[PDB]
Design a protein around this ligand. Structure first.
Ligand code: FE
Ligand code: FE
Ligand code: FE
Ligand code: FE
Ligand code: HG
Ligand code: HG
Ligand code: HG
Ligand code: HG
Ligand code: HG
Ligand code: HG
Ligand code: HG
Ligand code: HG
Ligand code: HG
Ligand code: HG
Ligand code: HG
Ligand code: HG
Lengths: 341, 340
């Protein structure tokens, strides 16, 4: 029931963000929500090439680092890498089949594209700091610590994808498949999308930001300056990505775009709150392990932990959630020098 | 069964291009086939921004056009728009879910992205040459002549997509869904995939080039210089795209990748041939609509048809197919200037 070109003539201004008629013509002269067109414009204007950044000196810097510090840096890098591997593909595979307005369709493809550039930049960095990149790459997949911090990300995307598949194939209803009963509900599928988006929002809003702090800590010490420039370029893109997810959720919860979504949003509030807290926790936990055999110069488990509570608070309010943590001022205001945005 | 992040640590250098384990880590330090990495690098180096292109004068030229030239012009542009609309999402929705090597996964995404840019350029052109783009865009969807020419593009993709879903949900075998027997053969999916690519190859390699010739006819008349600028940037992308499909197809036939794929290519050669013959003819049939109100000096049905055979033959030989048409030299050697 999915089509690469819906032959029905339709007003693309009146379609909902998701689950309406698949987009046929790709036009950009008009939009139901211009924020999406603005996002495409800004992301294109931000286009950059990793190779164009010199990382010549990070190698010796990396190598002179104290062992515990090498670990901190590389684990963090490994984490960023995983996240972007997932982000390069997932929004395209997960959202495209359910988008009904073109500006959003294209924003998603542009956003996903920008994530591949991020992946490209990681290879660039790794290549220039270790002897055998394969050692780093191979550890991303099975690193117990990583799948542990990242746990649940692929699963939200994977379930939505499968549900989407059943929906498109079988349509809404109570069906049977090889002797088993399989129920398909548009409502359950909207829930899944909603929680999946909320989760990607955390991913962009919190997970990455925590990593930015771990990377910029080195920059503050004039260390890994190649990596730093890349991270800076990456953080500028994330702000945009963050903006898209926030608007999507806000338009969804606000009931303007899809009433049922507004409803749904309300019913899983507590569910979302918990999801958020869970993510803030994983990050804390990661932090607790990355700084066990030694803390770094200007960052430690406790500072990082405060940061996570700090930014989590801001992100959650930005999406109408209650604050889970004690309100406090930024505990590492020096980071603002790197977050050009 | 599909996964956004496969947990098995796997040698990505040994997976097949398609149907292997979904790519987990995105690494570009090595590649099974470097031609894909090379394509990503070139496309990136070719990044361009449409709006930046000056089309301030295209409206003047365009308005001053004889009614039929306008029609020729717009009908053509509307077709390009339809194709880029499909090519912006298609590769991502149809292929992404079946790729098993990172360099190919990223190439597909860059490629698709490159197409959204092609689409943004058309809006840029449109919005600047007509008073209400809605007429154009609305027309793209309903224009029977246009759909007739594009017939079978969205269908291959849609078919492949659907079988893919079954495959991912049910896995291979004969199943019972809602009391009906549904068969899921991977070999059969592989054929859908293979023919889909062959069709995209025809789309990138022939359908777009004929469209370029039409666009460029105007440039040669010193008219529509903004469009022309854009068409050249686009042609430059299209050359990388078909290089990409030719390579996929040729690598598959070689037997160097999934052996089952090479048997399929051999087994399906007539289908391959028949689809190019059918695409060529659609491009030929379009002339009747294109030239409804009259032709232009140097651009007519005949020229058009001769160009179609000329180029189709070049393409088919590029992927090892027999040539259906009578050999000939380029009927429009002047297009070379723009194509480079
Ligand atoms: Fe990223
Ligand atoms: Fe991002
Ligand atoms: Fe294109
Ligand atoms: Fe193309
Ligand atoms: Hg999601
Ligand atoms: Hg998700
Ligand atoms: Hg941190
Ligand atoms: Hg750190
Ligand atoms: Hg929720
Ligand atoms: Hg949430
Ligand atoms: Hg295809
Ligand atoms: Hg296709
Ligand atoms: Hg032509
Ligand atoms: Hg066949
Ligand atoms: Hg063939
Ligand atoms: Hg001919």
């Amino acid at each position: 029931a999915y089509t690469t070109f819906s032959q029905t003539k339709n007003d693309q201004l009146k379609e909902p963000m998701f689950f309406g008629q698949p987009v046929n013509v790709a036009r950009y002269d008009q939009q139901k929500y211009d924020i999406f067109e603005k996002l495409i414009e800004k992301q294109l204007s931000f286009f950059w090439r990793p190779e164009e950044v010199d990382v010549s000196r990070d190698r010796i810097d990396y190598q002179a680092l104290p062992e515990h510090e090498k670990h901190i840096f590389i684990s963090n890098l490994k984490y960023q890498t995983l996240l972007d591997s997932i982000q390069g593909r997932s929004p395209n595979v997960a959202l495209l089949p359910l988008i009904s307005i073109p500006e959003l369709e294209t924003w998603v493809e542009t956003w996903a594209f920008s994530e591949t550039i991020h992946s490209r930049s990681f290879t660039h960095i790794i290549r220039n700091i270790v002897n055998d990149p394969s050692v780093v790459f191979d550890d991303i997949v099975t690193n117990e610590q990583i799948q542990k911090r990242a746990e649940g990300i692929s699963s939200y995307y994977d379930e939505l994808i499968e549900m989407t598949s059943y929906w498109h194939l079988l349509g809404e209803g109570t069906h049977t498949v090889n002797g088993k009963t399989v129920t398909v509900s548009l409502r359950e599928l909207k829930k899944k999308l909603y929680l999946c988006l909320m989760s990607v929002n955390a991913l962009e809003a919190i997970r990455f930001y925590v990593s930015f702090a771990c990377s910029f800590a080195f920059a503050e010490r004039e260390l890994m300056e190649g990596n730093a420039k890349i991270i800076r370029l990456i953080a500028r893109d994330a702000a945009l990505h963050l903006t898209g997810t926030q608007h999507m959720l806000n338009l969804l919860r606000s009931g303007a775009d899809d009433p049922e979504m507004a409803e749904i949003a309300e019913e899983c509030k507590q569910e979302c709150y918990d999801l958020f807290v869970q993510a803030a926790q994983q990050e804390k936990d990661w932090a607790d392990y990355l700084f066990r055999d030694g803390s770094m110069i200007g960052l430690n488990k406790d500072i990082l932990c405060q940061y996570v509570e700090y930014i989590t608070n801001i992100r959650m309010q930005a999406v109408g959630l209650d604050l889970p943590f004690q309100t406090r001022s930024n505990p590492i205001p020096w980071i603002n020098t790197w977050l050009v945005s």
